[model samples]
Target: CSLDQTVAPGNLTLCGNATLFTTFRPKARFIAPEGWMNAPMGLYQRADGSIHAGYQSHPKHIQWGNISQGAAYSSDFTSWTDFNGSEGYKTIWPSQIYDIRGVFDGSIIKEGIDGYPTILYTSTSFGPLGATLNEAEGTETQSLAYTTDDGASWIKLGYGAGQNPVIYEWPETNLTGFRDPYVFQSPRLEALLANTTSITNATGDHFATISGGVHGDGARLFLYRQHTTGEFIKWTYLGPLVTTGYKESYGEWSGNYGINFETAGVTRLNPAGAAWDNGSDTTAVDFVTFGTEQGRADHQNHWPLWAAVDYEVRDNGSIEAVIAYSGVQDWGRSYAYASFPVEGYRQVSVGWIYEDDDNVILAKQFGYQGAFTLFRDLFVKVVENVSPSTPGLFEQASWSTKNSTDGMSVTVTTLGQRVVPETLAAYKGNSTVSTLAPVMLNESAAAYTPFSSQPTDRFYALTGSFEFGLNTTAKAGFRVLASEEEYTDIWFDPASENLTVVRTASSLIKSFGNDTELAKVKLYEIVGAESKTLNLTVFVDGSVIEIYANDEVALSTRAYPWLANSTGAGLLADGTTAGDVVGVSGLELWDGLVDAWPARPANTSQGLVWDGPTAAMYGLFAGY
Candidate 1:
C-alpha cells in the first residue's frame, strides 16, 4: 500500500487486519506522523508552561535526503500533538535561500531573543544532491527563527530573505562537516567553570556549540557565547570544546567514540545532593553527550556516546577538554539524543529510534520509518565505592566501578537514565496489574515460569529483581514477546558482566536488524540497585523496547514479531546446573500499557511536503 491509500485524517489508517500494517510500527512511543525521523531537537518549555519538542523530519518521503523540521506540543510529555494533521506546529522547512537545500538539526532557547522562543538551526544549501559525511566546502551554515507569540507562531530571522544565514563560514577551510547547533545555559555550571578560571559567574551565561570534524585530525565542537550585551543571534567564537582523535577511546570498556561528533554540547551535573560552591568535592560532573559519526568498528554502526569531561584553557584562550572517560550512549539503535534540563533541577532526554527495515523499501510503502524513544531522565551516578576488579580501570573514573558493592572510596561519575515518570504515569491507570511470585530459573527451557495469564496486549511493563545464585554464571535472564518461532532474550551474562540483548530470532523478516547489543553493567551488588539484587524495569512497546538495569545502565532496542502473536513473557535461564538457580522476586508486571499518541481527528495530511509560508500559516492557528 502507498501513502495515499493507507492514510486517513490525523493518522495512518490502512485497509487490512489490525496487525497487518502495524507489525513493526510503534504505537506506544512518540513517532513522526509519517516520514523519516532522526534526532530529537529543540526541546524546551514554552512561556505558557507547555512542553515543546522538535525533530529532524523529511516529510517528502519515507527515506532520508530532503529535510525539514517536525515538532510536538504537550502539557505533559506523554500526550503528544504531532504537526501532520489539518494544522501544524511552529516548525521550519527548506524555505530560505540559505536553507533551500534543507534545514538540519537545531535547538530551542526558551528566553532567547528578548525573552521569546528562538530556534537556532543548521541550514544547508548544497549537497551530493543528497546528504553526505563530506559536505561541500561552505555547504552548511547556522540560521535562526523566533516566535513572538510564545511559540504559537514562528518567523524566520531574516523574514525569508536577508541575513537569514546568521553565522556563515566554517571554522577553518575543508572540514568534514559543520552543523547541528545546540544552545544551553546554566548558572551552576557557570559557578563550576569559575572556580578554576579567572572568569566568574558573569563570565559566561548563554552558550552554543556547532559540531563537525577536520578530516584526519579529530571530531570537534566549536563553542560560541552570546554577545555580552544580550544579542542572542550574534555570538563570539570561544573555540573548539574538545578535539580528540577519530574512532578513539579512553578506557577499554569506554567504547570508541567516533570519527566526528554530532549533537555535541555540555551540561553541568551535580553529584546527587552535593554542593557546587567548593570545587573540593567531586563538584559537578561536566556531562557532555556526543553523537559519534559513522560510529566505531568495535561497537558497530553510528551511535551516541558520553564523556565525563574536564576542561583546561589553551594559550590562545580557547578551552579544550581533558578526556577523563567515555562510554556508549545506548547499546541499541538509538542516536543523536538531545537533552535539556527540566526546571533547572534535572535533565530529561529524547532521541532518534531509527528504523531497521529492509532498505526502508518497506518504509517506502508505509510512509513512516522512525520514532522517538520514551523520554529519559539524565543524571550523574556517583559510585562512591570504587571497587575496581580490573587493575588499571580504577585510574579512569569514567569507566565506573568494577563491582557495585564492596569497593573503596575512589569516587567517579557515570551518566544515568530512567524512563521519565510522566510516561509511567500516563499509562499508569491503564495497566492490568499482575503480581509475580518468586520463580526458580534453570538452564533447560522445560522449566520456566510464564507471566501468568500471558500478556494478551503487546504493550507491557515489568518491574522486579533478579538474584543469580552465587555460582550460576553462563547466561541468565528474562524472555518476552515469545512464541513458537520468536523470543527476545534479555540476557545477563556474569562472565561478560553485560546486559545482552539477543534478538536474532525476534522477527520473521530475515533482513530486520538483529544486532546483539550489549550494555556493560555492574552486577556486583548490581551497583546502583534499589533492590538487594539487580533491579529490573522493562518496558516493551510494539517495536521499541527499553530495559533498565537499576538506574545505572539501560539497553534500548527495537524488536519485531512479524507473526504478532508472541505476547507471552517468562523467566529464562541458559547454561546452568540444576542446583544453581537464578531466583526472581517481587516481579510484578502491568499489561495493556496504553499508547502515547494523543487523540486526533479523521483527516490525512500524508505526503504533504510542507513549504515556508504554508508551514507558517498552518502554525498560526495550531492551538491545542
Candidate 2:
C-alpha cells in the first residue's frame, strides 16, 4: 500500500504478528522509544533479579551535541518497559545549572546506606561564541541524582545542604576533558590507590573511576575515593591508573575508557586508524590486567570494544564482560564481546543474527524526526571452549555443509528481473566512473514471495555468491525496495574501493534529509586481478539488514519504509549487458533459520507505545 493508505499506530504496536520479544525492532535497538535516540549508559541488577538499563537519550533525532538520560527495566533481557513513561520524558532531563547546555554519559551505583539507586552524570555548559568558558560556569562539572522512589523521580545532590549540582574538585590538570563517571566499591583500596600518597584510607573503600584528557599525555583514567561515611558524597583524587603515555608493546589507546572489574583491568574501543583505512577494526576491543606481586609491588596494564560496559560473573569466579561496538551493518551498531575472568580460561567465538527494523508508532512530519531505528547486536554461542589456547594460539575445527551447525542452505528462484539503462542524469558518481544502470531482481518465487505480502512474522537469512568476471570498474549487490520510486541501494563500489550503503530513496516520506550516508565498509581490493568471486551473507530480521562480504567487510545500517507494503528485495548488477555484467551463482535465501530461541509469541505485547514528535520543542523546557 502507498503512503496515502499507510496507517500509523498510536501506540507501540508490532508489525503483523511480531511481538516485542520476537519481532526485531531493527531501528530502535534495545527498547528506546520510537522517535527517540538512545544509547547504553549503565546496567545494574536489582535484588529481585531484574535488570535496570540506563541510557543517553535525545528527543526525536540523535542530537549528538544535546543529550539527556533515560532508563528501562527488563526481566528476561528480551521484553522491556521504559521507566521514563513510554515517551522517555520521565527520566532526568537537563534541570540544573551545571547541565544547562546538556547532560552527558554516566553510570549507576547502589547507595551504601539504603540501597537506593544513585546516578552519577557529567553535567556541562558551553561558553560564548569565541569564549573558552561559559559566562556563568567556567567548565564541565560532575553531578549526582538520587532516586529514593525507585526511579520515579530524581533529585540533584548538591555540595550544600539544599542547593544542587554538586562540584567535586579535581587536581589542576593540563586539559579539562573530564567526563564518563563509573562508580564502584573496591575491596583492594590500599593497593588500588597506593600511587596517590595524598589520600589515606582503610581497606573497604568506595571509589569512582573518572576519565580525563591530559595535555601531551593523552586520555587518562583517574581514581577518586569516597570519603563520606554514610554516603558516597565526598572524594579524594588518587592518581592516574593508565595514561596514554604509558609505554607498552601492546597497541596504544586514547579516548573514553571503562573497566569491567572482573579482570581488575581497563578496556576501551580501539581507534580504527586513519579515516579511510581498510579491513575490520582489528583492535576493536583492547585491555590491561593489573596484578599484585611480592610486597604489594605495583602492577598495571590496559585493553577494548565500543561503549556501555556490562559484566557477568560466573560460578567459577571467572567474569565475562559484554562490550559493545558500533558500525556492524546499516542497522547493526552494537556488538558484544565476552571477556574471560581468568587469563587461562578457554574462550569461544560467536555468530550474529539480523536484528529486525521496525516502523515508528508515530511519524516525524519534519526533519529526520520520523521513524527512528536502533542497530542491535545478536549473538549465539557457537563454540564451548578453545581450551589450552595461548597468547599466539592457533587451532582448527572441521566444518561441513551437508548438515552443518553453522547454517542451513536454501535455493533462490528469481521471478522477475530488469536491466539497467545505459545512462541516468539523476545519478552522480566519481570523476572516473559514469552512471551505470543496475539489473534488478523484482520478484522471487522460491517460497519467499514479494516482501510486502509476507506476514510480520517473516525473518530471513540471505546468502549469495557473485563473480565479477574481469572488468575495469565493476559493481554488484542488492536493492531493498518499498516501491519503484523508493529503495535502499547497497553494493560494492570499486571506484572508492569500499562497500557503500546509500539510503537516498528508501522512503517516499521526507523523514531524514537527502543523501544520507547509511554506512561504508572498506573492502579488500583485487589489484590487477582477472576475475573475483565474492560470497555475501545477509541476515534480515524485520528492518535490520546486516551484510558480511567475503568474510572481510561488513556494513550494518538501518532503513525505514513508510509505505505499508515496503517489503521487497532484488539482486542487482552494475551497467547493462553492454558494459560490465556480474555473474550470479549459488544464490540462496532462507526463511526459518533464526526462529529457534525466543520462540515467537502468538502475537505482539500490549503495552504503552509512544506518540510524541516534539523534538524541536525540547530546548524550550531545558531547565524545567
Candidate 3:
C-alpha cells in the first residue's frame, strides 16, 4: 500500500474481536443500563437464557453519592429494571438506609436450599446511631437480607433495627467497621467462609480484634472455618488480598473509583483450585504462596470476570482438576484486568508494570524498554523454570502451559501495545531540513514499508547524522511546498516577499532583498526550534517546492497549510556549504501513525529530507 494508504494520524481504530467475553457479544462488553451499576447479586439465568441481575443501587435522581437503596435487578446486561420500586415496600428505606445499605450481594441457590432461586445478600451501610456530621454523613450499621422469589420481592432478614451482629464492634484496636458480607460454602470445612472486612468500632466487646492482623485501608480476606452447626465458627484473618502501604484505604483496590482505566481486576479463587492432589492421596493448597502487599483497596465499579476456574475432586480425596485467576496491571494505568477466549485453558493478563517498583518481576526481554504489555498463561504443573536460575519473571513457566479443570486455557495472545520513544522520535528530533524515509519496523527488518501499514505507532522510530566541513555559519531561511510541483499563487505572491536562490555548481544560497518581507520573515534564527517563515512575497511560478529549515521563522511559514495542499516537518538546521542532514525517520506519506491510545497528538510530528548543498528534501501527500 502507498504511504498515504498505510496509516494516518489520529485515525487509528483499536476495536477488535480478541476482547473479553466475545461469546456473549462479538464485542467484549461490561456496564449496566443505569450507567453506574455493579455486582450481579443473585444472578439467575432462566431456561430461555434470559438473566436476572441485582446490585447496589444509587438512584441517579437522588445524586446522593453514597447512600443507596438495597440492590436493583436487571433482566439483561443491557436493560436494567429496578425492583426497589417494584416491590410493595422499598428494599432499603432512607431511615434504615444510611446505616445499612441493604444486601448488595447474594447468590441464587439452585437446589436443596430453602428456595430454588432465592437471593440472599448482606445489608451494608455506613453507621449505626449515625449523627450526620455535616461533612461525614453515613458511617454505621450493617446486616443481611434475603428474598424467596426471583427479585420481584425482598425481605429484611437477620438483625435490621437492632445492634446484634455475629461480629460485634470492639474498641481496643480499631474493629468497629464490619459490613460487606461475601458468603460461600466450603465442603472441606463442612462450613462456609465469608470474605469480608472489619472496621474500627469504638464500643462493643470481644478481643477477637487484638490478635488478628491489623486492618488498614487495604482489604483483607477472613477465613471463617465452620466449627459446629451455625455456632462453632471463628474468623482467621488471611492478610490483605492486595496491598495499600502508602495510602490508608479498604477493599481490593486497583486505584481510584468509577474509572476502570487505572484499576486492576482480581478473580476470586474458587474452593476447588485452592486444593492440589498429592501422588499418595490427600489434596492441599498446591501453589507455593507468597504474601501480597495491600496492592490497592477500593471497590470496583463493575464485575470484571463472571467466575474463576474451580478444581474438581475425585474419590480417595484425590484431585484431578486445575484452575487459576487471571490478574493484570497496565503501566501508568491502575490495575490489570483479564482477557478471555473460548476453548482455551490458559489464564492470561497483561499490564504496564512500572519500572520503579521492585515488587514486579519483569520479564528479561523487556529490559530498558519504555512500556510493554507482558502476557502469560497459567499452568498447573512446574514445567518451565521461571525464577532466579534465569533471573527473568516473564519467562515461560510450567504452569504457563497447563490446561485447567474447566477444559480451557486463557492465552494472552495479544493485549498491550508497545509504546515508546520511537513512536515520538519524529516529533522530538529536528524537523528542519532532513531526509524522510519509511521505517523497517525495527533497526533490522526485511524492507521499508510506509508508516500506515504498521500495526501501531509504536513501531516508528527516528535517526540523525552530520557531515564534516559544512558551512559553520548561522543564517535564517524558509522552505515551503505547494505540492503542485510549481510555486502556486496561493502562497508565492512573488511581489511583496521575493528572494533569489544563487545556484553555485554544488550550492544553493538564498539572497534576500534589503527591506523586503522575505528578509523580515527570515530575521529570527534558532538552531533547533521548529518554526515557519512567511514572506508574503512572490516567487518563480509554475514550480512547486516543499521547504524545511532550522531558523525559527523557517519552520513557522513552512507549517502554514494555507500555503500548500499537504505538509509535515520538524525543526533542526545544518548550515549550508558543506552538507548536513537531520534524518527524519518514521516518515509516513499520509498517515501520521497516531493510534487509539496515543500519548501525543497526530500529524504534528513528521520527517523531512535535506539533500546536498543543492537538493531539497520534501514530498507532496499523494495516494497511488
Candidate 4:
C-alpha cells in the first residue's frame, strides 16, 4: 500500500538528490477484462523530455494469465494518458506468440547503432527445459530483438534465444534456470548485448563469439559485437559480477533474503524488520531484529545490486573496462535512491523497518516537533561531492547557510532564475523543480491549480525524515509564493526552548501572532551546533516535501507532514532569540487552501487576497 522512496544523483545537475518514486500494489487499470499481469517495464524519459511506459498484460493462458499490451504517455508525471486498444496499436507490437507470449522487460538504447531509440525485449515461449518437437526447437531458448522509431515498431534482429536449463555446462558442470533476456549497448564495448548467465560459465561475452569452457549453469552474458550482422560473443561473468561484497545479501528492498514475502504471506505481517537469510532456517528460526542486515532473505530476484560495463579501447588500442553499478534490483527494476553505494566487491544494505505498533503519533507529539525549512540557492564546484551522504543522523557533516542583509532567505534572483544542481536551491526552494517530487494538485477536484487564494483551514499535508542530536538544531521552513493578502506563518520551538514542556503540559501546534511581519511565529531548535549552519532548503507545494542540505536533498517526499498540519490558522517563526526577527516577505494564497494565522491584528481585515497565477512579491520566483 506504500510507495517506496529511492534517491538518485540528479541527472545533469548536482543541486542535490533526485529521489526516484515507485510502488508495487495493483493499479486501478490492472484488472481489465483479462485476468492479472506481470512484466512491468517502461518508465523512461525520451529525448524530447516526454515520458513513456510499456508493459505486458494478459488474463488468459494461466501462466500467460490474460496476456495483452499496455502503454501510457505523459509530459508531466502528474498527468498520464493511457492507450488500451486501437490507440495502443500505434506504437506497440502485435499480440500472440503462439504457445509463447510477447513483450517482457522492454528496454531502450535511445541511441543504438543507427543513432535512434532501440527497444530490447523478449518473447516468452513455453515447454520444459529441453523439449524440442523438431517444430519447437527454439521454444526452449530465449532470443533477442529490438525496434527503432521510438518503439513504434520492431524487427527481430535474430540474436538467437537464451538456453534454459542450459545444455553443455562449461568446465563440465551442471546448471539450470536460464530464461529472461535483458540487453544493452556497452558503453565500454561499443556493441549491442544481452547480459545472459547460466550455471557453469559465470561471464558474458560476444553473442556468438563465446568459446572455451562448457556453457556452465545456463546463466550467461552474451553480446552482439558486430552491428552489420547479428553476430554475438560471450563477454564477462555477470552472476558474480552483479553479486558483491563478502555478503551475498542483496534484494529489491533492503534485507530481502530472496525469500518470497508471499511464502510468509504478502500481508504487512512479513515483519517490518527482517534480514535476508541465504542459509535456510528450516529448523526453529529466530526473528531478525531491527538494524540487522545479515540473515535476511532476498526473494525479490538476482540479489539487489547489479553492474554494467562499457568496453573501451585505450589510446594505445588496449581495451579497458568502464564499470557502473547498475543499481539495486533485477530485470527492469532499478534503484530509487539509497544512502549507501554498491560499488565495492560486495554491496550490502538493510533498511530501518517500522512495525505498526511503532507509535509514530507519540514520536511526533513528544519527541521533536516536525517542521519544514527552505534555504537560499547555493553554488558548488562539484556535484557528487555535495550530494546528501549518509543522511539522517550523520556523525559529522560540512554545510552552511547564507543569511541575507534583510534576513535569511534563498536569494533567488541573486543566485539565478531557477534552481539547478550546480546551484543547490532548485530542488529545495519554495517549489519543487526536481523531477523527484510530486507537484501539488487538488485531489478532491482532480485538478492542479496554483495555491493563491485558498481558504485558511485548507492546507496540503507534508512528510519527511531527519536526524539530529537531541542537542542539535534541525530547522524546517517553506517559502510561500508572494502576495499582498495574509502572510504565511511557520512556528517551531525545540524541546529545550519551549516553556510548556518546562512548565505543566505540552501542546503540539504553537499558535501566536502579531500583525507585524517580523515575529509572526517562531521555530525553535536544539542548541547543539554553533554558528555552524547547514546550507539547507525545503521544497513544498501541497503534496511534496523535499529536504535539501549537505549538498543534496536527502529526500523528496509526498506525504503531508503530520506535525506541521494544523486545523486552525497559525503563524510560524524560527529561533526565539531576543532580537531574532521571523517572518516571510512573499505570501501566496492558492485557491485550493487558505492559510489563516491564529492571532491576527484587531484592525486588519482578513487581508488583501490576490487570486491568480501571477504574484509580484516573488517567493523564490520573484527576482528570478
TM-scores for all predictions: 0.85, 0.51, 0.35, 0.38
lDDT of 4 by residue, 172-262 (tens): 1321222223333222232212232222232332222111111221222222232233322222322221112323233222322221110
TM-score of 1: 0.85
lDDT accuracy of residue 280 in candidate 1: 44
Q: For residues 293-323, could you state the per-residue lDDT of candidate 1 as single tens digits?
A: 6545533356677887777766554567777
Candidate 2 structure quality by residue, lDDT tens digits, 1-624: 112325542223322221232222432124345324433554555556665555555554422335676666655333456664544444777765678766765666665435677777777765431112222333556778877766656667654542334544555445435666666543333342344434344223555655554543444556565655555656656555444331211211111232221112233222321111111333223322221111111111112112222333333222233332211212133222121111111111111221222233322221112122222222111222222211111211111012224423211110010101110111111011212232222222121123322223224445566666444365667666445556666676544445656677765545332343323332222334455556775555455555666543444455555555555665655542444556556555443322211322432233322324543344322210
Please report, as a residue range, the 10-residue window in candidate 1 with the lowest summed lDDT.
4-13
Q: Candidate 1: where is the Cα deviation over 4 Å?
A: 1-20, 83-90, 128-134, 159-162, 188-204, 273-283, 297-300, 384-397, 400-412, 442-448, 469-471, 526-532, 601-624
- lDDT pick, better of 2 and 4: 2
Best model number under TM-score: 1
Using TM-score as the yardstick, the better of models 2 and 3 is 2
Candidate numbers sorted by TM-score from highest down: 1, 2, 4, 3
Backbone collisions counted per model: 6, 33, 92, 129
Number of the predicted model whose lDDT against the real structure is largest: 1
lDDT of each: 0.67, 0.40, 0.24, 0.26
Instruction: Assess the local accuracy of residue 340 in candidate 3 as a C-alpha lDDT between 0 and 100.
Output: 16
RMSD of each predicted structure:
6.3, 15.3, 23.2, 20.3
RMSD of 4: 20.3
